[PDB]
Amino acid sequence: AIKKYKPITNGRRNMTSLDFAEITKTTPEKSLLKPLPKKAGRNNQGKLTVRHHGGGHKRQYRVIDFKRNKDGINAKVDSIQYDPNRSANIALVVYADGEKRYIIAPKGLEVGQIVESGAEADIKVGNALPLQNIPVGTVVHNIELKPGKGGQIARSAGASAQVLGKEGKYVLIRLRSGEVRMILSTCRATIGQVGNLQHELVNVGKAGRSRWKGIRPTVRGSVMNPNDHPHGGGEGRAPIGRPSPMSPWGKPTLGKKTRRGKKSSDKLIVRGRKK
Amino acid sequence: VKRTYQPNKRKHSKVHGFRKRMSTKNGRKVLARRRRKGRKVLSA
Amino acid sequence: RDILKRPVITEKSSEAMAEDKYTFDVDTRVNKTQVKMAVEEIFNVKVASVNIMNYKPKKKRMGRYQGYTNKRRKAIVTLKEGSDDLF
RNA sequence: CUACCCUUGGUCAGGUUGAAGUUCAGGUAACACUGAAUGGAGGACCGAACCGACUUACGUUGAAAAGUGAGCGGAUGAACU
RNA sequence: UGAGUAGCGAAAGACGGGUGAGAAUCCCGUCCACCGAUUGACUAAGGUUUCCAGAGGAAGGCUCGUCCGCUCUGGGUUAGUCGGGUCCUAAGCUGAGGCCGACAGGCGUAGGCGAUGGAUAACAGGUUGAUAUUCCUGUACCACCUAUAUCGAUGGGGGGACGCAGUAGGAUAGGCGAAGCGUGCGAUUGGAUUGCACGUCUAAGCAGUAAGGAUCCGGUACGCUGAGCUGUGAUGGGGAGAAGACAUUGUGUCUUCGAGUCGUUGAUUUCACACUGCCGAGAAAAGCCUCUAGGGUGCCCGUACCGCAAACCGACACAGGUAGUCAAGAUGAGAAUUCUAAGGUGAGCGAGCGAACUCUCGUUAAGGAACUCGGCAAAAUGACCCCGUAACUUCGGGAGAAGGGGUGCUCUUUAGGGUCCCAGAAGAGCCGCAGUGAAUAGGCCCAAGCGACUGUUUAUCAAAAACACAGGUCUCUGCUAAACCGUAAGGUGAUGUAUAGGGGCUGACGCCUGCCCAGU
RNA sequence: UGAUAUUGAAAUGCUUUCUAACCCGCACCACUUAUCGUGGUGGGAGACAGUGUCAGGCGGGCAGUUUGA
């Protein structure tokens, strides 16, 4: 749900926030919180290596498990909680042995689920099975990429990726970006979509509200001096003035592909994207 | 008007002290260059 | 031992308290335990307590050539039986 | 000193406005609409400390290598230290 | 030389008596004047002997100096409990092995160092020229040692342990007006039911108290801790407005002796991140508790002094700058305004005269912006309580729109409120030129341009129509992501995963965004 | 971007397959109640990548200079 703020002032005029109606506990669970110190886009050399980062509100990392590796012990969901670090909420789940953990909350959850290796207690949201046990046409999330490493794909809020056919050792996944690729078949995955679907609709309202999430102002290269940015100088407002828009470090920044993300995985990717 | 020198003992001994100069390799050279001159204050 | 150097005979802060307290200049690397046992071994008294304070080297002594004095450490002892620890 | 950042502390007489929500009423199959209390939001309003430096007069071997007087802006925040 | 010329650094002093070779300038005194959310009191940096007493007057002091933050000679800093170490750890630095590298060396694991935070046993009064939870008196507290079932970790678990904003409450400190004591009862017309000034007192130890909450262990499922404040004593103690007794103004002073302490009214910015709400989701480790595997002793550093300043940063005894704690009375929203208290201060050149001219300040006939680039600058409005209030609008606003009225004191009657204190109605009357009688606190309106708004900037000629901005759009990026530093290791991105990250442009909101892919 | 070394084994120079090389900011175990590292096991990839010598192309991102009388 979405709260729409009334225009009592400029700044709060066209604003919008989340309702926070699915959030139950409203308090972090102790003994699963590890201290996180802000780095403000700074390298081990101490130099600003990523721009527009810095400042914000103090937070604390929640030790979440993306491995989901239990031998078939049950777990009753306790509460859905807020997490400052990600878009998705989290869910505190107590296993029937005594261990408590944090899961990424799939949409529509208070139920109680199983960390399976197959469809014994059948497929349904929250249940985390290896991929080969997952029927073709499901919508799964939190997919590993290498066995026993932990979920890496489809972890954001309102995220998902459905399983197309199989190939005996791999499966075909169509990721949220619009890509089709081959994933190893012994890779785990949870069922369902990820909740918090309204996170995209929020209008953050003012310039000091994006300022306490950890952002900093972004000067435009056209309002810089000719030795700072390739766009740089001139008299009056000047156009781009080159054959193509550049980045601040002298590379083309609009159109040109930069895919050196891997080469060994070029043979596994079947499609492009529709983004 | 705030001026350029605000004295402070910890910072002075932590930047220009003997241990700081005897710590790096171009600080041992500063000491070896101040000892040759005959200076009565090598580090402070 | 001879961890005691000198008696300190001053006007008020050594004679206005010489009803029971006796002040010395001592070595600069000693305790009040060392001095409390040294007085009792030298003079054969029972020393109730002892207070110590350090003095910085003053630059007062300046002739044609300016210089500093010695850093000095002064110890006051309060006796429980006996007397005559500076004449 | 100055610019950003990290960590961990500190300060912001007073006074005034009255958002969401709640609660009584009433109105409907109902939702849900009008009223009255309660509530106390906000890069909100006035204004000292505090932080600034818009106009002007003075000074210009200055009191001072950038200040003073009179007014002026913010003053719970993208604050100041 | 300029030339005995410019200046002598914000400001109230006057006289009396001393000392002395010499006095506006030094000491003592009375009157006057200034600050008093500070020029008063206490401390962190930083200075580093500048602090005190006795002497001095060559140089320093913007004059003088018999004086001093200056010269000489002797002194002054006292801790089991205060701030640091023998306890803990942020950020960061360092790093045995280790990885990378022409050399030098860069990075990094275990481990270590490290506060601005966490833990940790003492309070009143007296005393010196100079110390003061440190010395002394009184009363305490903690750790260890010796005499006359327990211990449980380097390991597990709990706690420690936390944001911002809003009111409602309990109690207290401090504030004031009567009574109760202790001194005074008069100048110049008057009075004597009159005028002043003081009211307590600690920690610790005992009571009771608003409020507020399937390793014996932890996790799964099937009356308890703490807690401001009060009170008995501690305290036949200490102190004190002052009172009576002793020698050289005993100036004064040592000395013993003995006095009140009661109830009430408002009320914290101190005493709970407690309770409620919100989104931006609010350190770590030890001390501590817990479960199992098993009559004495008490150390080192600081301590004086200045600390909005003549002692620190500004070359100066320099109108600037400098973190934090305390916070009186009348008036009031109030830490505003004016006058004062505690306490400090009279600013290191004066005496004349009262020209031109410059600077700061007050007033002005008649008119009124005519001045001039330009109503710049100044004047005008300004407080509270009542009526009243337009086009427009994103329905919040504009709006303190605009425009008007009231305001002192005395006396009468007269429903309030809190528990002496706070708030009102109406009527009758007195006065002057004047009633927020001083200080202080909006001028407003009619139209156009730019930028939506709060914010920021050329430290010392520019503060804006510039930058930022929420929102729009395009584009690279499938995770050892792209991008970036190094261009090695190692990192940020991110302990994130396409509703996510980097780059380019535009710049709230409303209506919209035409055509062309020659050519780069 | 190509040739050559590290670099092999097979079947129809180009193709397809295998695995021991080389690699894994993948999992588990031991040094060690660290995992930086080393090693050892399982999985993934596999003669490809990474790296060395040689060669062609883009390269105001950066450098040195020129721009007459």
Coordinates of C-alpha atoms in Angstrom, one line a residue, chain A:
Chain A
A1 CA 0.0 0.0 0.0
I2 CA 1.0 3.6 -0.6
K3 CA 0.6 6.7 1.6
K4 CA 0.0 9.9 -0.4
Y5 CA 1.1 13.0 1.5
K6 CA -1.0 16.1 1.4
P7 CA 0.7 19.3 0.1
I8 CA 1.1 21.1 3.4
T9 CA 4.4 22.6 2.1
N10 CA 6.6 22.6 -0.9
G11 CA 9.0 19.7 -0.6
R12 CA 6.3 17.4 0.8
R13 CA 4.0 18.6 -2.0
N14 CA 4.2 15.6 -4.4
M15 CA 5.6 13.0 -2.1
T16 CA 4.7 9.3 -1.4
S17 CA 5.7 6.6 1.0
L18 CA 5.1 3.0 1.7
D19 CA 2.3 2.0 4.0
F20 CA 4.3 -0.6 6.0
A21 CA 1.3 -2.7 6.7
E22 CA 2.9 -6.1 6.3
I23 CA 5.7 -5.4 8.7
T24 CA 5.0 -7.2 12.0
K25 CA 7.9 -7.2 14.6
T26 CA 9.3 -3.6 14.0
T27 CA 12.4 -4.6 16.1
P28 CA 15.6 -6.3 14.9
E29 CA 16.4 -9.7 16.4
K30 CA 19.6 -9.6 18.5
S31 CA 22.5 -12.2 18.0
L32 CA 22.0 -12.0 14.2
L33 CA 23.2 -8.4 13.7
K34 CA 26.8 -7.6 12.7
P35 CA 28.1 -4.0 12.8
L36 CA 28.5 -2.3 9.3
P37 CA 30.7 0.8 8.9
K38 CA 30.1 3.2 5.9
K39 CA 33.0 3.4 3.3
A40 CA 31.6 6.3 1.3
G41 CA 32.8 5.0 -2.1
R42 CA 36.5 4.9 -0.9
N43 CA 39.2 2.4 -1.9
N44 CA 41.7 0.7 0.5
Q45 CA 44.0 3.5 -0.8
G46 CA 41.5 5.9 0.9
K47 CA 40.7 7.6 -2.5
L48 CA 37.1 8.4 -3.7
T49 CA 36.8 5.6 -6.3
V50 CA 33.0 5.7 -6.8
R51 CA 31.2 9.0 -7.0
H52 CA 28.1 10.5 -5.4
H53 CA 28.3 8.2 -2.3
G54 CA 28.6 9.2 1.3
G55 CA 26.7 10.2 4.3
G56 CA 23.3 8.7 5.3
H57 CA 21.8 7.0 8.2
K58 CA 23.6 4.5 10.4
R59 CA 22.6 0.8 9.8
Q60 CA 23.4 -2.7 10.9
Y61 CA 23.9 -5.8 8.7
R62 CA 21.4 -8.7 9.2
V63 CA 23.0 -12.1 8.7
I64 CA 20.6 -13.5 6.1
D65 CA 21.0 -17.0 4.6
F66 CA 20.9 -17.4 0.9
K67 CA 22.2 -21.0 1.0
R68 CA 19.0 -22.6 2.5
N69 CA 20.8 -25.9 3.4
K70 CA 18.9 -28.0 5.8
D71 CA 18.1 -31.7 5.6
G72 CA 14.3 -31.4 5.8
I73 CA 13.6 -29.9 9.2
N74 CA 10.5 -27.7 9.3
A75 CA 10.4 -23.9 10.0
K76 CA 7.5 -21.8 11.2
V77 CA 7.7 -18.2 10.1
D78 CA 7.7 -15.8 13.0
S79 CA 7.6 -12.3 11.7
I80 CA 8.2 -10.1 8.6
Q81 CA 10.7 -7.3 9.4
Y82 CA 12.1 -4.2 7.7
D83 CA 15.7 -4.3 6.5
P84 CA 17.5 -1.1 5.7
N85 CA 20.0 -2.7 3.3
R86 CA 17.8 -4.2 0.6
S87 CA 14.5 -3.5 -1.1
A88 CA 12.9 -6.7 0.0
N89 CA 11.7 -7.3 3.5
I90 CA 12.9 -10.3 5.5
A91 CA 11.3 -13.1 7.5
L92 CA 12.5 -14.6 10.8
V93 CA 12.0 -18.3 10.7
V94 CA 12.5 -20.7 13.6
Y95 CA 13.4 -24.3 12.7
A96 CA 12.0 -27.2 14.7
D97 CA 15.4 -27.9 16.2
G98 CA 15.9 -24.5 17.6
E99 CA 17.8 -22.4 15.1
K100 CA 16.5 -19.0 14.0
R101 CA 17.4 -17.5 10.7
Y102 CA 16.5 -14.6 8.3
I103 CA 15.0 -15.3 4.9
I104 CA 14.2 -12.9 2.1
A105 CA 10.4 -12.7 2.2
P106 CA 8.5 -13.9 -0.8
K107 CA 5.1 -12.2 -1.4
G108 CA 2.2 -13.4 0.7
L109 CA 4.0 -15.2 3.6
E110 CA 3.3 -16.1 7.1
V111 CA 3.1 -19.9 6.5
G112 CA 5.9 -22.2 7.5
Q113 CA 8.1 -24.0 5.0
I114 CA 10.6 -26.7 4.2
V115 CA 14.2 -26.6 2.8
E116 CA 13.8 -29.6 0.5
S117 CA 15.7 -31.6 -2.1
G118 CA 12.5 -32.6 -3.9
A119 CA 8.7 -32.4 -4.1
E120 CA 7.9 -34.5 -1.0
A121 CA 6.1 -31.7 0.8
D122 CA 5.2 -30.2 -2.5
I123 CA 6.4 -27.0 -4.2
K124 CA 5.0 -23.8 -2.7
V125 CA 6.4 -20.4 -1.8
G126 CA 9.2 -20.3 0.7
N127 CA 10.2 -23.9 -0.1
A128 CA 13.8 -24.1 -1.4
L129 CA 14.5 -27.0 -3.7
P130 CA 17.3 -27.9 -6.1
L131 CA 16.5 -26.9 -9.6
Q132 CA 16.1 -30.3 -11.2
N133 CA 13.1 -31.0 -8.9
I134 CA 11.3 -27.8 -10.0
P135 CA 8.7 -28.2 -12.7
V136 CA 9.0 -26.3 -15.9
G137 CA 7.0 -23.1 -15.8
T138 CA 7.3 -22.1 -12.2
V139 CA 8.3 -18.7 -11.0
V140 CA 11.3 -19.1 -8.7
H141 CA 13.6 -16.6 -7.0
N142 CA 16.9 -16.4 -5.2
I143 CA 18.8 -18.7 -7.6
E144 CA 22.3 -19.9 -7.1
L145 CA 24.8 -19.8 -9.9
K146 CA 27.4 -22.3 -8.6
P147 CA 26.4 -25.2 -6.3
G148 CA 26.4 -24.6 -2.6
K149 CA 27.4 -20.9 -2.9
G150 CA 24.2 -19.1 -2.1
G151 CA 21.4 -17.4 -4.0
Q152 CA 22.6 -14.6 -6.3
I153 CA 20.0 -14.0 -9.0
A154 CA 16.5 -12.6 -8.4
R155 CA 17.0 -11.2 -4.9
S156 CA 15.4 -7.7 -5.3
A157 CA 11.9 -6.6 -4.3
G158 CA 9.2 -7.8 -6.7
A159 CA 11.7 -10.0 -8.5
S160 CA 11.3 -13.4 -10.1
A161 CA 12.5 -15.6 -13.0
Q162 CA 10.6 -18.6 -14.5
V163 CA 12.1 -22.0 -15.5
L164 CA 11.9 -23.0 -19.1
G165 CA 12.8 -26.4 -20.3
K166 CA 15.8 -28.5 -19.3
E167 CA 18.9 -30.0 -21.0
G168 CA 19.9 -33.0 -18.9
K169 CA 22.6 -31.2 -17.0
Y170 CA 21.4 -27.5 -17.2
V171 CA 18.1 -25.7 -17.1
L172 CA 16.9 -22.6 -19.0
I173 CA 16.0 -19.6 -16.9
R174 CA 14.5 -16.4 -18.2
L175 CA 15.7 -13.7 -15.8
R176 CA 13.8 -10.5 -14.9
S177 CA 16.0 -8.5 -17.3
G178 CA 14.6 -10.5 -20.2
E179 CA 17.5 -12.8 -20.7
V180 CA 17.5 -16.5 -21.3
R181 CA 20.5 -18.4 -20.0
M182 CA 21.6 -21.9 -18.9
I183 CA 22.1 -22.5 -15.2
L184 CA 23.6 -25.6 -13.7
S185 CA 20.9 -28.0 -12.6
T186 CA 22.0 -28.8 -9.0
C187 CA 21.6 -25.1 -8.1
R188 CA 19.1 -24.3 -5.4
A189 CA 16.2 -21.9 -5.8
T190 CA 13.2 -20.7 -3.7
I191 CA 9.6 -20.6 -5.0
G192 CA 7.6 -17.5 -5.8
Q193 CA 8.1 -13.9 -6.3
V194 CA 9.7 -11.5 -3.8
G195 CA 7.3 -9.3 -1.9
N196 CA 7.3 -5.5 -1.5
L197 CA 6.1 -4.9 -5.0
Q198 CA 5.3 -1.3 -4.4
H199 CA 8.9 -0.2 -3.7
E200 CA 9.2 1.2 -7.3
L201 CA 6.2 3.5 -7.0
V202 CA 7.6 5.7 -4.2
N203 CA 8.2 9.4 -4.9
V204 CA 11.0 10.3 -2.4
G205 CA 9.7 13.8 -2.2
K206 CA 12.6 16.1 -1.5
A207 CA 16.3 16.6 -2.0
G208 CA 17.2 15.9 1.6
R209 CA 15.2 12.7 1.7
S210 CA 17.4 11.1 -1.0
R211 CA 20.3 12.6 1.0
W212 CA 19.8 10.5 4.1
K213 CA 19.8 7.2 2.1
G214 CA 23.4 7.9 1.3
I215 CA 23.4 9.9 -2.0
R216 CA 25.2 13.1 -2.9
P217 CA 24.7 15.7 -5.6
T218 CA 25.6 15.0 -9.2
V219 CA 27.1 17.9 -11.1
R220 CA 26.5 17.8 -14.9
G221 CA 29.6 17.6 -17.2
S222 CA 28.3 20.5 -19.2
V223 CA 28.7 22.9 -16.3
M224 CA 32.3 21.9 -15.7
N225 CA 35.6 23.4 -16.9
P226 CA 37.4 22.0 -20.0
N227 CA 40.1 20.1 -18.0
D228 CA 37.6 18.4 -15.6
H229 CA 35.1 16.8 -18.0
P230 CA 35.2 16.1 -21.8
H231 CA 32.1 18.2 -22.2
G232 CA 33.5 21.0 -20.1
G233 CA 33.9 24.5 -21.3
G234 CA 32.4 26.9 -23.8
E235 CA 30.6 30.2 -23.6
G236 CA 27.0 30.3 -22.6
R237 CA 25.0 27.0 -22.4
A238 CA 26.8 24.9 -24.9
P239 CA 25.6 21.6 -26.6
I240 CA 27.4 18.3 -26.4
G241 CA 29.7 19.5 -29.1
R242 CA 31.4 16.1 -29.9
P243 CA 30.5 13.2 -32.1
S244 CA 29.2 11.3 -29.0
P245 CA 28.5 11.9 -25.3
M246 CA 31.5 11.0 -23.2
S247 CA 31.9 9.9 -19.6
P248 CA 34.1 11.9 -17.2
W249 CA 37.1 9.6 -18.0
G250 CA 36.9 10.0 -21.8
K251 CA 34.9 7.0 -22.9
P252 CA 31.7 6.9 -25.0
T253 CA 28.8 6.7 -22.6
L254 CA 25.7 6.1 -24.7
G255 CA 25.3 3.1 -27.0
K256 CA 28.7 1.3 -26.8
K257 CA 28.7 -2.1 -25.2
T258 CA 31.2 -3.0 -22.5
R259 CA 30.6 -6.7 -21.9
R260 CA 33.7 -8.2 -20.4
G261 CA 31.6 -9.6 -17.6
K262 CA 32.9 -13.0 -18.5
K263 CA 34.1 -15.2 -21.5
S264 CA 33.6 -18.7 -20.1
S265 CA 29.9 -17.9 -19.7
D266 CA 29.4 -16.6 -23.2
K267 CA 28.7 -20.3 -24.1
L268 CA 25.9 -20.5 -21.5
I269 CA 23.9 -17.4 -22.5
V270 CA 21.3 -18.1 -25.1
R271 CA 19.6 -14.7 -25.6
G272 CA 20.1 -11.0 -25.1
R273 CA 17.8 -8.8 -22.9
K274 CA 14.6 -6.9 -23.4
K275 CA 15.4 -4.2 -20.8

